[PDB]
Write a structure and sequence with these properties.
The structure is cut from a larger assembly and holds 5 copies of chain A.
Chain A lengths: L15 E3 L8 E3 L15 H8 L3 H10 L6 H4 L6 H6 L15 H11 L18 H12 L3 E2 L5 E2 L6 H5 L5 E8 L6 E3 L5 H4 L10 E5 L17 E3 L11 H21 L4 H6 L5 H9 L8 H13 L5 H14 L9 E5 L2 E6 L2 E6 L2 E2 L2
Helix pairs in contact in A: 6-9, 12-13
Protein name (chain C): Sigma NS
GO molecular function (chain C): RNA-directed RNA polymerase activity; single-stranded RNA binding
Pfam families (chain C): PolyG_pol
């Protein structure tokens, strides 16, 4: 007898994804569960991962021991996906994902960490262009204790950065700008793009972030002494091992990656037209990019436009609006509006109307 | 033993769907998620608009109902809150302002005086009223042309005389309405020079309207081309006869078009639902395909079709509603004198240079 | 070096719940209302659904012909095996809450028409006044599906296949209904006897009839009553020795009787019933799931009418009380004025213009 | 006329079928439905029915009670169409639908089923020629519980084969060849024509197939190791009534019918040239015949030629290549290829390039 | 006489059925212009043509 029981098909499949080449703007489409013909449910996985990477140890703790999976197969191919490369901190020559702005910050990171890490593949020295996402991922991994291998992999051999060991206790983050108005520190609207202040790296001292806990179980109380149980990035005690400047550089780098991808979105006319029915795209983008709006000019304007249009915008409309913002400079008259803080929320108010509102993002 | 098969337990009841603009009649749309394919661009359909274009041959459309339906009509129409769709389906006048229109009452009065003498026409069009529901008049005139008799709470009266043209339109399956104007001292087809409202108010203009009817041979033939047009007759070519209701037919066509335009105008008020269903990208494409019978006789519908084709068949309800409002307010948009009108391969073509600005194929009378 | 064996407690913590463990059909699985805030707990009877699906035994048992051994002997021969498992594997149970004396003549009739080709002693102990209707129903389904039972062990796919089970493969829907000779011709009538009475007088089972129908699901022909072409009635199939028509009718009546006796025994579970007074979907789900048996019996029809009149929102205690009232009192509502009509293949009762009840074909596959 | 009469005409055709007088090669070609271009689409109804018949009970469950058509008048005509006769398993003397090869299997089936069923009309006793399709249909229906009446009818009165009941649960099938390599079972490419195996009934024992269930819950366990939800034909419990060898003979006989029909078509160059414009004919032929590749190497060569040519070949080229394959024998050194079975599929690979692949075949 | 609509890709019915699935001629509501008797006369008359 012969008893070779080769398996055979058992089910089907469903789902869809758009923007294969893109990294942050890649989105996964699922039909609405309640009713098959309601608004499509979009979701950006890599953008959520990037936002969660702001606590690198908690984001990469499992990969230290558990998920030591086969990575050689993914990297070593004729055409590896750009998303995988940027996820594993590899420079890519793709024009849509490479920017020439802020490169001085890139080489600053390289000279900070190149002495003890094979940083050549992350950012080849002397290159006029670089991949912001790759450097952000490299910074996160290095802060997490990992070491990028010359053989295109990661190993948990390096030392743990002190800031990552502190961000374990905190779950919520909220970047914002600061200025010395009337000889005192106060939160201000973003007056610079990340793309421009990554050039003048001294300006990164203006950036500040506030961390705080996901407090103990309590069904109704809105606060657990929210001000007493929170800390700010610039308030932490100074120490050489603390990657505070690398952390702020990583945040700005992720923001720059998002902006360059939005710029490249303009040329993707075919897929934008084919996905005109995806109106949840803009609402999801507004929901998930909330961490980066409080630091940049153009992201703030884009968020304001998205809120004005009612959280329903297919990709082509977002591409056109972003092109308009980039080309026309500051368009909206923000001079009539003011900033305010309400129970931790970061909002722009004009009169009594709430033009914009941003809540703390989730780090893990 | 004892056996009864009257219990029939078959079931083939679909997967899922949805309906939008329930209060509307023509633009009432059925939405189906195309689960057969991975692509999630939802499919859209306008049942009542398809039925209205079907009814251009009233006898072939209404023959099936001469015997079958005897369950209930009054139970629906005489409900607490009868739907405008059902009431206009059974030729009942509707009080809603969104559906009713005030312009073009002259044609309604004309049809009422033509058929009022031999039909209880009061509920179709109350006498002396300024506001009339054009869809109700269209359904009434179609049913009368098919030999029915209306009632206050029913329509199951297949007892009236049957129009000659309603019988003539059994041999044909395709129709192509188009305007015709006296140019160069000879008859010639032209672009739509008047909106339907102007010619309904001044009913003398309807003489310019014309249509062409065609057969559908079921033989396994090669796709027939010119010189096969002998098997086709124009509406105005038919010999005159008292029973033969040509002007009734033209009035029905214009009335249906006016109902569509009134619905489109009222759509602008529906900004809430238009926003709630902004993801229905197939609305523009489906409406563009389905309205193709009316664009050949109206300025504004022609402009809407042209803008739809230029945009690229990607309009949700909000975009089409706003564009329609802009067309209504502005009126003329582009210099169509630069373009020219041509007929080729039995299709109604308007072209500028070499590009085909808009293509219209004759409709399916069914 | 050391072994790496270990476990993580991968579990959300909050999960479902099961109620009425002892009961066979009335066992239900309670799930919170999804991710919604309505807090109307879902209810579902798994064994009742399986019983209704068993009315096409081959399609309902084709999987087990090859795809299981599963060490079911351990389940059957446990120290305290679940009565649900025993009744699922056609084993008699001596529990007073699942055994009835009525209809035993039909039980021994099936036990002797299948007596010699199967070891039927463990299914129905010969001479015992009481018996488990569910066990006999499952035994009939299994044997009709082409199995043979064993005491303690799994069924063996070795016996012959009845012709009716093969015929029923083409159909997906079923609709039992009674018959009567009125005006010299057969016509559908309301139930006149309880399933117990009609089982005791086995000749009455000839009055039962059912009609099956295909499931095309092509998005066409939905409203057409030309679907009468694609249907056949149980009594209309040509007679044959191996076509177990009477076993099929007996199995249907036996399942109905099992449901009845379980409903009767539910009245004694007052503690659990009152502890679970918050699950109001119990009555609605039971009404939805019993729809195949109402057309054949008086008391099930009365219970369905009561549930519909009460708005479908009632808990187990209310169901028990109403069932006891129906059992004790007898016919309550006036059916002389209630007309019985079939429209679009639906078994409905109409009072004037009001539709007192409507029953649709059950899903049989 | 009072008005100009430019108007519409279609003469819209509906329905079309060619290759008449055949059984399997019948194709109801039609114009493309949704696309404006009038490209020719194809489908083989009888071939699909034969492929679905591999689960005989689920294939013939309807006719046991539902259809009961007036078959008597159909086959009693003066010159009834051969396809209808073969569909009801009636022997036909046409030279283009019979072959002397494989008569041993026909004799075996006659002696194994003739003792309880009339069989002379299905296959005349001792005849040197036979129609394979008729015997395949006869064995399928006899497994389905039917009884072939002499008077042009099937009576649902016979016993039901155990394998037919077993196959209800499985919607997907996979035949293949096997060999005793290194003292263990292992899949091999086909090494014999169906003629050799029908003639050598003992050699038929080497054939095997695997079946699989269908569902819609997403596939689990890497979508290829889902093996407890599948079974192999030879692993099923042996029983007198379980028609294992009848099932294998059915599959081989259907394959032989297809081969004989293609060989007969080899001489029909006239109509093939008249219909050579149809190249989707080859694509649909490949798609429907994919179930038969893994048992006969001559069919494998035709499939390989079609795949290399790009899934687009005209009937004339198919005929020429089939004749060339039949005359030549082994055309290429296939030993350079390697056999693999991944993600549930069955494919042969030479080097890294996949030479040919096979997908799930649906039977019910 | 009974009247039936066209079928659709189905040839699988050889059993009993009745009434409004194919409504019969005599059930039609009588009317002065509804020529049932002329129709029956024509049917019989063409049958007689075939006979002669």
């Amino acid at each position: 007898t012969v008893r070779v029981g080769v398996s055979r098909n058992t089910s089907g499949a469903a789902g869809q994804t758009l923007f294969r080449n893109f990294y942050l703007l890649r989105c996964n489409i699922l039909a609405d569960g309640r009713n098959a013909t309601k608004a499509v449910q979009s979701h950006f996985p890599f953008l959520s991962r990037a936002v969660r990477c702001l606590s690198p140890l908690a984001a990469h703790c499992a990969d230290r021991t558990l998920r030591r999976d086969n990575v050689k197969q993914i990297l070593t191919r004729e055409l590896p996906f750009s998303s995988d490369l940027i996820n594993y901190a590899h420079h890519v020559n793709s024009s849509s994902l490479t920017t020439s702005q802020g490169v001085e910050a890139a080489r600053l990171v390289a000279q900070v960490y190149g002495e003890q890490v094979p940083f050549d593949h992350i950012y080849p020295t002397g290159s006029a262009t670089y991949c912001p996402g790759a450097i952000a991922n490299a910074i996160s991994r290095i802060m997490a204790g990992f070491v990028p291998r010359e053989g295109d992999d990661f190993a948990p051999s390096g030392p743990i950065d002190y800031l990552a060991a502190d961000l374990i206790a905190y779950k919520f983050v909220l970047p914002y700008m600061l200025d010395m108005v009337d000889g005192r520190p106060q939160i201000v609207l973003p007056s610079h793009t990340v793309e421009e202040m990554l050039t003048n790296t001294s300006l990164l001292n203006s950036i500040d972030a506030s961390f705080g806990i996901e407090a103990r179980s309590d069904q109704r109380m809105t606060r657990d002494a929210a001000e007493m149980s929170s800390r700010s990035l610039n308030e932490l005690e100074d120490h050489d091992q603390r990657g505070r400047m690398p952390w702020k550089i990583m945040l700005g780098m992720m923001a720059a990656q998002l902006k360059v991808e939005l710029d490249a979105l303009a040329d993707e006319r075919t897929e934008s037209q084919a996905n005109a029915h995806v109106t949840s795209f803009g609402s999801r983008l507004f929901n998930q990019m909330s961490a980066f709006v409080t630091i940049d000019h153009e992201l703030m304007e884009l968020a304001l436009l998205i809120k004005e249009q009612g959280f329903a915008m297919n990709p082509g409309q977002i591409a056109s609006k972003w092109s308009l913002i980039r080309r026309s400079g500051p368009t909206r008259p923000l001079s009539g509006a003011r900033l305010e803080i309400r129970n931790g929320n970061w909002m722009i108010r004009e009169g009594d109307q709430t033009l914009l509102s941003v809540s703390p993002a989730r780090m893990a």
